Amino acid sequence: PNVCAVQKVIGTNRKYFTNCKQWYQRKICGKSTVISYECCPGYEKVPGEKGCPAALPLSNLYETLGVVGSTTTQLYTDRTEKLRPEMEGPGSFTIFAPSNEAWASLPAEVLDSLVSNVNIELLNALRYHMVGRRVLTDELKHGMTLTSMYQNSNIQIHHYPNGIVTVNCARLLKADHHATNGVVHLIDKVISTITNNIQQIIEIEDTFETLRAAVAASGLNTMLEGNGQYTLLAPTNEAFEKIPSETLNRILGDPEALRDLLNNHILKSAMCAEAIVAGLSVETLEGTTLEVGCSGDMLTINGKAIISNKDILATNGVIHYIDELLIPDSAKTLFELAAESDVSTAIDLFRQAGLGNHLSGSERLTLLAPLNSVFKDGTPPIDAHTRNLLRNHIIKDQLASKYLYHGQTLETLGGKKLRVFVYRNSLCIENSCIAAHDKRGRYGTLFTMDRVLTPPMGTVMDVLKGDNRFSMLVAAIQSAGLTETLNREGVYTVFAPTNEAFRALPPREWSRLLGDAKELANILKYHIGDEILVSGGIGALVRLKSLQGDKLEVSLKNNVVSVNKEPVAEPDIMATNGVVHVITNVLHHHHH
């Protein structure tokens, strides 16, 4: 009875006093916890009965400070010789009472303001912690302000979805201790008035002179002066200095890159550090996601403990000081955003082939970079041939793969025109298909691909004529009158049977070709799809209309293309007027 829980991280005095819950966080900021049991606010154990069945009497607000252990608050209240009669007297009051540890751990700046004029400033601080009406935590809505009893100065309230409540980012430790004339809330810090907006803090602090100048040049000072709830992850001078000067001046002197940079430090609502007890994904005003988390008493951004000062309060939100600059992809060159990524091998090869200048400056390009796993079994060598192929992985203009359309053509720096194939569940450029989301830089975009491109060199007939396995196919095509179809412009998919395929036909099948050139033509045309289906465009099952009219059933299973239950021996031989897939038996006519 009257049952409450204490969750202590081990090593500390960091405690979360709660209503007993049914699911408790195993770890708080990566540090495991022990759980304990206390009696709830205002109840005491009697020996021989379990729980805490006895309620304690209410007392006035001054006395309740003692009941919750806020004895320094009492001592200082008694010192003022003014406020204790008010706390014992008529009215309805809230006090956010700092804990003894809070008063004993004053930041040097609040100690400074008190010791200047001790009697008056202690009375003012104590009044700032109070409100002239009772307010329970049920009435503490996120983002509200309460008017304190010091000069009508606002107190800022946050009430996060995980139940943590903060008062000027001080954590509310023990809530809703009723008094005969109000309520006592025990808080974790001594709070002070909030007099500057975010822009004013930028303009005051010498650690933000570089940020200040960037904000001014971008024109963002208007927003940071305005009404709003923001978190600024404010980069210090030291953060900017860690960036090579040629990178930084490139970003700061370009209005689009400068604005994306600054926006990538701003979140759309105010977030006190004490809110964060596990990983949380947030989105910046630039659009990038950051992983906010924590390790002990250190806030982390993407796992890196780069927050050197937490919870600097402004009238329009919260500032946390950050030691590294959060450069978004949209401010980067292609080399900057790709060199340490899933395509870093491919990026290294562009560099070794003398093509790095395309990636390191302001050229408007799209880069087709295969994944590192493509090069698991080795890298091509740095020739003129590899150089030339790599130049044909560099596209003119900055593109977004999602806005590409079927039949679009892309011009390369090697002078080639590559074909875009848009299928239902994949996007391919020639034989190679997009394998991850774009990374959009300032001037160029990285497309991550699953394969090295193989640009076409000749027509279908050039392909078939160049390989000894298709001599019967080439002769049959001529005999069937199909040769010039397959050497002129088109979008064919040729399931090309080898010589062993034709010799495997039984006599009853072969003898249907004898004296019947139109039957040979009909058979060959059944092997020719009327649109280009590279293997990366094949899902569970796709119908492809042949030139004979009936449809082929094409599927991909265990990374092998099949057509009418015939596996492809060698896929994706690209041609200027189609794609060739090799098969080792002739296709059987199916069901329509």
Author numbering: 46 to 637
Would you copy out the relevant sentences from the publication that reported this structure?
The principal constituent of the protein deposits is one of the most abundant proteins in the extracellular matrix (ECM) of the human cornea, transforming growth factor-β–induced protein (TGFBIp). The function of corneal TGFBIp is elusive, but its ability to bind both integrins and ECM molecules indicates a role in cell adhesion. TGFBIp consists of an N-terminal CROPT domain followed by four fasciclin 1 (FAS1) domains (FAS1-1, FAS1-2, FAS1-3, and FAS1-4). The X-ray crystal structure of wildtype TGFBIp reveals an elongated banana-shaped molecule with the five domains arranged like pearls on a curved string.
Among the most frequent pathogenic mutations are R124H and R555W, both associated with granular corneal dystrophy (GCD) characterized by the early-onset formation of amorphous aggregates. A striking feature found in both the R124H and R555W structures and involving their mutated residues is a crystal packing interface between the FAS1-1 and FAS1-4 domains of different TGFBIp molecules, where residue 124 interacts with residue 555 in a second TGFBIp molecule (i.e., His124 and Arg555 in R124H, Arg124 and Trp555 in R555W). In the much more hydrophobic R555W interface, there are no water molecules close to Trp555. The interface is organized around the Trp555 side chain, and similarly to the R124H interface, the tryptophan indole ring is surrounded by a hydrophobic shell of side chains contributed by Phe547, Leu550, Leu558, Leu559, Leu120, Y121, Val163, and Leu167. A crucial interaction sealing the pocket around Trp555 is made by Arg124 from the second TGFBIp molecule, as its guanidinium group stacks with the tryptophan indole ring in a cation–π interaction. In addition, the Arg124 side chain further stabilizes the intermolecular interaction through hydrogen bonds with the main-chain carbonyl groups of Leu550 and Phe547. The FAS1-1:FAS1-4 interface in the R555W structure is significantly more hydrophobic than in the R124H structure, with a ΔiG p-value of 0.11 and 0.40, respectively. This R555W FAS1-1:FAS1-4 interface is also by far the most hydrophobic in all the four TGFBIp crystal structures determined to date and has a calculated ΔiG of −9 kcal/mol, which is also the most favorable value of all the intermolecular contacts present in these structures. The Arg124 and Arg555 residues in wildtype TGFBIp do not permit this intermolecular interface due to size and electrostatic repulsion between the two arginines.
